[PDB]
């Protein structure tokens, strides 16, 4: 068997909840290299011949996400269940629970990487969202909480 | 002293989280079992034997007692 901290993963969200979460995340795909490059070239061309709001994107860096957590700025955190150095992610669920930041465990790091234009993303978290999706973000947070903390309240028990 | 520094409570928080998540080592488990059944007079000898330093054994016993108090009293 495995200690209680191990096997906490693999108790991922159901099909519908995971699909809804990925659908919501797909609306905030960070601009790829080509998109950013073309935008910068267009801006340069406009400047050559002669005020945008804060951009919205999903924060995914492991160090960046961990920094976002413990400051209560992050609202939703997605955790990969197939991280080869498990020690890099063993502490994330407990840290999120202590900080109160909602969190979920999703199947596959490649799935997280796909929504962030990366081969493999260890974690994916959201800090700020548009007012249109604020209600959707709250609904997803509530659904994730109900389906993870209550449904899998024993995830931290029974080795 | 010019660089002794203090915890800042960030090291405290991280260490507490690590202690909670990691669990208890088999020798730590035996120490807490002895404390909850025998007491300090019997636990400190085992702690010193495992560690070899009386001060380290006393510190470990105090940490185990604090952990037990935080656990059983909640």
């Amino acid at each position: 068997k495995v200690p209680p901290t191990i096997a906490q993963f693999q108790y991922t969200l159901d099909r519908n909840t995971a699909a809804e979460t990925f659908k919501l995340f797909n609306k905030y795909r960070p601009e790829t290299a080509a998109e950013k490059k073309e935008r910068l070239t267009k801006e340069a061309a406009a400047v050559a011949e002669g005020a945008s709001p804060k951009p919205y994107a999903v924060k995914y860096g492991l160090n960046h996400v961990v920094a976002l957590i413990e400051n209560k700025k992050a609202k939703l955190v997605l955790i990969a269940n197939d991280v080869d150095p498990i020690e890099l992610v063993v502490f994330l669920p407990a840290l999120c629970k202590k900080m109160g930041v909602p969190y979920a465990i999703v199947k596959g790091k490649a799935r997280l990487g796909t929504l962030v234009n990366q081969k493999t993303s260890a974690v994916a978290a959201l800090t700020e969202v548009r007012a249109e999706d604020e209600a959707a973000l709250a609904k997803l947070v509530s659904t994730i909480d109900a389906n993870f903390a209550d449904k899998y309240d024993e995830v931290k028990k029974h080795w | 002293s010019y660089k002794k520094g203090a915890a800042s409570n960030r090291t405290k928080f991280v260490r507490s989280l690590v202690r909670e998540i990691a669990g208890l080592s088999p020798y730590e488990r035996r120490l807490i079992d002895l404390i909850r059944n025998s007491g300090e007079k019997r636990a400190r000898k085992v702690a010193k034997k495992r560690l070899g330093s009386f001060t380290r054994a006393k510190a470990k016993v105090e940490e185990m007692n604090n952990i037990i108090a935080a656990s059983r009293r909640h």
Binding site: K1, P4, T5, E70, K72, A94, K97, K98, M99, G100, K156, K157, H158, W159 | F13, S16, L17, R19, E20, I21, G23, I67, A70, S71, H74
Partner: peptide, 15 residues
């Protein structure tokens, strides 16, 4: 030997 984890530290959220 095999016992459930305890939330002594995680019981109270960090305000």
């Amino acid at each position: 030997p095999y016992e459930p984890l305890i939330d002594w530290f995680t019981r109270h959220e960090e305000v």
